[PDB]
Design a protein around this nucleic acid. Structure first.
Ligand code: K
Ligand code: K
Ligand code: K
Ligand code: K
Ligand code: K
Ligand code: K
Ligand code: K
Ligand code: K
Ligand code: K
Ligand code: MG
Ligand code: MG
Ligand code: MG
Ligand code: MG
Ligand code: MG
Ligand code: MG
Ligand code: MG
Ligand code: MG
Ligand code: MG
Ligand code: MG
Ligand code: MG
Ligand code: MG
Ligand code: MG
Ligand code: MG
Ligand code: MG
Ligand code: MG
Ligand code: MG
Ligand code: MG
Ligand code: MG
Ligand code: MG
Ligand code: MG
Ligand code: MG
Ligand code: MG
Ligand code: MG
Ligand code: MG
Ligand code: MG
Ligand code: MG
Ligand code: MG
Ligand code: MG
Ligand code: MG
Ligand code: ZN
Lengths: 91, 384, 205, 50
RNA sequence: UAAGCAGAACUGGCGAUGCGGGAUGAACCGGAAGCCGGGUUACGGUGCCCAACUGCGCGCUAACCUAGAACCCACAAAGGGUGUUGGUCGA
RNA sequence: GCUUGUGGCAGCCAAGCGAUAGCGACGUUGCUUUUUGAUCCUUCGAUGUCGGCUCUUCCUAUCAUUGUGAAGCAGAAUUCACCAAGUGUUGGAUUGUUCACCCACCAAUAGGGAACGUGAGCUGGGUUUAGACCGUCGUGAGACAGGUUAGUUUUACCCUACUGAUGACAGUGUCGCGAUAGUAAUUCAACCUAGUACGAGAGGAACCGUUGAUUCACACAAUUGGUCAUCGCGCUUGGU
RNA sequence: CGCCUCGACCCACGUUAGGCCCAAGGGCCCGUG
């Protein structure tokens, strides 16, 4: 809503760096699981795209990103900020 | 019924039993984890507690009220002349734990360390290691020594050096019997450790090869004995009212009717002091090396020519002539007590750990009274 | 259940993939009857019910302790061989001199230490998991339970066991070459004395 | 927040069912609770909206 | 209200009684008795403690609550379950 | 000890309130043994009867602190619920109290058990001997479960338990291993975040980082403080 | 580590919804004085 989430890809694909989530000073680091790649997408405003061969490993890496961006101690029906899966498919 | 008010229990159950230590020299109960990537090095040292003094330094610590301001701090002096390596010990793994594989000793052992193997040195023939030394003379004997070393390189997973102190350098100790301990080598491969420890035979390893300035170390020793003691001093319980019949320095209730026994958790009277203790995170403020300017108690701000020893000597200790460590705070045991110094078991990634100490002043006034002079030269110039 | 009756010097039992309480029951009868039993590889004994049920059973046991002096209370051993030793002791009248002697005839080990790496290790058919447990039901290994509750020599046991299996694999290759040589020898020796061995033909297997 | 992204965030924070016994958050098509402590109760209610 | 409470009817029992079983126990189950040898049973049992099958046969159960496991007896209820397995009556 | 009426705690239904956020009448099922009764099984050749002080353990039906789910949860606050007994739960006025009730601090000032824990541990204010007042009652001697004041608190050297201390166990010594047992850290604040998120406004968080403090534990004596028969030095009374 | 007053015959790992098997229910041994 207010604080723009800043994401940074650490390696070529392996890492993502989330900062300014809800305007916080903590740095959230998620390492992609083995064989999974991530890219700050173009042609879309605020999308990250995860790629891989194993369905469980790609889906679990997206689950890690979403769960590290949970709003604490606030009404989450109002504070809807987060990172959510928008489309899952097989290319 | 439940107790009317809550207070926490007196004393820790984690230091039980409060008995006399079974050893005099403090023992390393766990060496640091070996990192085979680092170069070979020793992990511990032996030293002797000389005395205490206080220093003045300017503190660099942003966010503190002491930032850019001077502080006074009490320091303990530990005299640490170099150790002599006299052997190697190997350990192999086993489902029951580590086991000594074999040991190799040097050809020359001083009589100070050989006294450690005798209850009455002067009544004996002093035969210890007299026939072992003959392996270094023949050629079959040298073959055994090399074969033992090669067995170390092939089968051992832990290699430790056997080292002893040069206890006669400290005349005030009045002791000729050296202190002997095993020190682990914590670098390189097993062949690297064996080669490193073998090249040190009959050689002096200084304290600077083991520790450096501004490092947090652990000190192991036996505390000061105090003998039989009551519950008030041994455990810190509160006294009873003045009106108490049969005395007031006891625990009133030592247990309920059930269980119909006294529990191990109730404070009782017994031995106080002379316990083994491992104290960690003591910072090194200075390394005084014999034959160097760092041995003197002069700083960059104080150019007065003085020695580390206070006026009149260290009380009950003597004069510090060998290498020494200045350490922030107090240290286990009384003066003259042998203390074991060990490298930290954990990573010291902290501000206090990483702080750089710069001394402004070292007090060298007499500790045997309300001393007011820093040197004997100043005292004589004052009185004419 | 009675004893084996096999009357040997000592039987070495390979404990891998046996049910813990069924193995301890048979061993206890053997010891009480006078047999010496050596149990190796106690780290791979199986207990029905998975890790979770077995782990909390130990945690309840770990709760038990003499309130006034714990070093007097129950002793909770963490190693797989001492756990199996205590399970067997529970099935023996160990406070009598007969049960004291019976329990002194039992040796239990993790892995296969010498000299039993070069001896014959038997199995107990009515304690094997493959004959005792349905294929879908949960179970855990003794070493896994022991590792979860404080045992710290699982790695050295595993490293030693890999070294032992390498040596046994080489001894197995050598034994196969000697077996092929043996079959050629009995083939050539079959014709050289063809007439004499006519009575062995109907019982040749 | 754009309304389309609002609908995405409500798929995880809002469109849920609540157990009336153990307060567990459930998928919107749930009929029974997933929890052993409430006995897998069918007494469910929708998650209240702002 | 109840009580290992207080009071009556018929019979048995303990008291006055060991012995086998119910881990243990006045009364429960079996059974009553001189000192013994051999055979067989009662109640209760046959994985070990412990003598006797890890016996032959069909299902049910999976307990992430300490699943459950011997009359008296050493407790459990109303109410629930899209756990699973049998049935009944219907679209 | 049995019982659980009464005391305390927890459920089922759902008429209503605002059906089930939170509650919940009329009914109905339980649990518990820190209430009080009911009983009279044990103890009358005696198990020291209130309360507090001290000290240790234990429970959970959780008050705070950790991690969460729900709200009629915008924020702040609060309420309901879950896993959880690891760590805490205080200083005082009146009262012999237990119970109570106020003052104050605090993150919070939760509830309980252990022979209503704990008198060869203390204390002895209360109960409850003998002295003595008062009121009521009695002809009286006397009574009162009404008030008041004064009223001896014995023994451990035994066994065990517990705390420490030596010690044999097939030479003697040094250096080691480590089964097993014990165990410990804890809570709060300031600054930055930020007058920011949120909110019409009034109000108003938090993570990371930094700096301190509380409670506890283990040491130590450089300095400060305390301690004197250093009988160390000095002064000084009376005597000699 | 130092210093010395009653034939008791037999070594695979691993898996059982798999590696001819379908138990050592085998094999070896003058097994013969
Ligand atoms: K009490
Ligand atoms: K102290
Ligand atoms: K006191
Ligand atoms: K059913
Ligand atoms: K009741
Ligand atoms: K009595
Ligand atoms: K008086
Ligand atoms: K431990
Ligand atoms: K020896
Ligand atoms: Mg809020
Ligand atoms: Mg309390
Ligand atoms: Mg250790
Ligand atoms: Mg007194
Ligand atoms: Mg001094
Ligand atoms: Mg039998
Ligand atoms: Mg332990
Ligand atoms: Mg009679
Ligand atoms: Mg009688
Ligand atoms: Mg007979
Ligand atoms: Mg069967
Ligand atoms: Mg019974
Ligand atoms: Mg039902
Ligand atoms: Mg009631
Ligand atoms: Mg009602
Ligand atoms: Mg009596
Ligand atoms: Mg008594
Ligand atoms: Mg008495
Ligand atoms: Mg609870
Ligand atoms: Mg607690
Ligand atoms: Mg009570
Ligand atoms: Mg009492
Ligand atoms: Mg008394
Ligand atoms: Mg009292
Ligand atoms: Mg008493
Ligand atoms: Mg009185
Ligand atoms: Mg009176
Ligand atoms: Mg009158
Ligand atoms: Mg009075
Ligand atoms: Mg705004
Ligand atoms: Zn539920």
């Amino acid at each position: 809503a207010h604080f723009p989430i800043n994401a940074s890809i650490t390696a070529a694909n392996k890492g993502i760096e989330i900062r300014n989530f809800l305007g916080e000073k903590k740095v959230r680091k998620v390492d992609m699981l083995d064989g999974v790649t991530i890219l700050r997408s173009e042609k879309v405003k605020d999308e990250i795209v995860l790629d891989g061969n194993d369905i469980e490993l790609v889906s679990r890496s997206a689950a890690l990103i979403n769960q590290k961006c949970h709003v604490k101690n606030k009404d989450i029906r109002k504070f809807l900020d987060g990172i959510y899966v928008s489309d899952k498919g097989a290319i | 019924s439940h107790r009317k008010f809550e207070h926490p229990r007196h004393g820790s159950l984690g230091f039980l039993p409060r008995k006399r230590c079974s050893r005099h020299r403090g023992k390393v109960k766990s060496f640091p984890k070996d990192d085979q990537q680092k170069p070979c090095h020793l992990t511990a040292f032996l030293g002797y507690k000389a005395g205490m003094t206080h220093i003045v330094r300017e503190v660099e610590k942003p966010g503190s009220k002491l930032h850019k301001k001077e502080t006074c701090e009490a320091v303990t002096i530990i005299e640490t002349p170099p150790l002599v390596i006299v052997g190697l010990v190997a350990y192999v793994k086993t489902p029951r734990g580590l086991r000594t594989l074999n040991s190799v000793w040097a050809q020359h052992l001083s009589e100070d360390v050989r006294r450690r193997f005798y209850k009455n040195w002067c009544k004996s023939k002093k035969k210890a290691f007299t026939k072992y030394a003959l392996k270094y003379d023949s050629d079959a004997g040298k073959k055994e020594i090399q074969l033992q070393l090669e067995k170390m390189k092939k089968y051992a997973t832990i290699v430790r050096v056997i080292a002893h102190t040069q206890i006669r350098k400290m005349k005030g100790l009045k002791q000729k019997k050296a202190h002997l301990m095993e020190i682990q080598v914590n670098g390189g491969t097993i062949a690297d450790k064996v080669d490193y420890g073998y090249k040190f035979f009959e050689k002096e390893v200084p304290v600077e090869a083991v520790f450096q300035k501004d490092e947090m170390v652990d000190i192991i020793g036996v505390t000061k004995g105090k003998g039989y003691e009551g519950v008030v001093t041994r455990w810190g319980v509160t006294r009873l009212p003045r009106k108490t019949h049969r005395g007031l320095r006891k625990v009133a209730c030592i247990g309920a009717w059930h269980p119909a026994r006294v529990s191990y958790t109730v404070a009782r009277a017994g031995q106080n002091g002379y316990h083994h203790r491992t104290e960690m995170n003591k910072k090194i403020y200075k390394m005084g090396k014999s034959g160097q300017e760092s041995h003197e108690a002069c700083t960059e701000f104080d150019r007065t020519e003085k020695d580390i020893t206070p006026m009149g000597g260290f009380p009950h200790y003597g004069v510090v002539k060998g290498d020494y460590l200045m350490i922030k705070g107090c240290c286990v045991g009384p003066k003259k007590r042998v203390v074991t110094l060990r490298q930290s078991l954990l990573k010291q990634t902290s501000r206090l750990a990483l702080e750089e100490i710069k001394l402004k002043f070292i007090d060298t006034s007499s500790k045997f009274g309300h001393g007011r002079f820093q040197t004997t030269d100043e005292k004589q110039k004052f009185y004419g | 259940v009675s004893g084996s009756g096999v009357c040997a010097k000592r039987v070495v039992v390979d404990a891998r993939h046996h049910m813990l309480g069924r193995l301890a029951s048979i061993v206890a009868k053997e010891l009480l009857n006078g047999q010496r039993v050596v149990v190796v590889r106690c780290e791979e004994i199986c207990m029905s019910g998975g890790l979770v049920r077995q782990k909390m059973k130990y945690l309840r046991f770990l709760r038990k302790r003499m309130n006034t002096k714990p070093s007097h209370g129950p002793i909770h051993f963490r190693a797989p061989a001492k756990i199996l030793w205590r399970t067997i002791r529970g099935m023996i009248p160990h406070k009598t001199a007969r049960g004291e002697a019976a329990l002194a005839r039992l040796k239990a080990y993790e892995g296969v230490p010498p000299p039993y790496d070069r001896t014959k290790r038997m199995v107990i058919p009515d304690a094997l998991k493959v004959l005792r447990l349905q294929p879908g039901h949960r179970y855990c290994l003794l070493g896994q339970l022991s590792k979860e509750v404080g045992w710290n020599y699982a790695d050295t046991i595993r490293e030693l066991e890999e070294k032992r299996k390498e040596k046994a694999k080489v001894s197995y290759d050598r034994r196969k070459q000697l077996a092929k040589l043996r079959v050629k020898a009995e083939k050539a020796a079959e014709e050289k004395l063809g007439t004499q061995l006519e009575i062995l033909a109907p019982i040749k297997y | 927040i754009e309304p389309s992204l609002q609908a995405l965030a409500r798929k995880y924070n809002q469109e849920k069912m609540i157990c009336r016994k153990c307060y567990a958050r459930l998928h919107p098509r749930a009929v029974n609770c997933r929890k052993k402590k409430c006995g897998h109760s069918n007494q469910l209610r929708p998650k209240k909206k702002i």
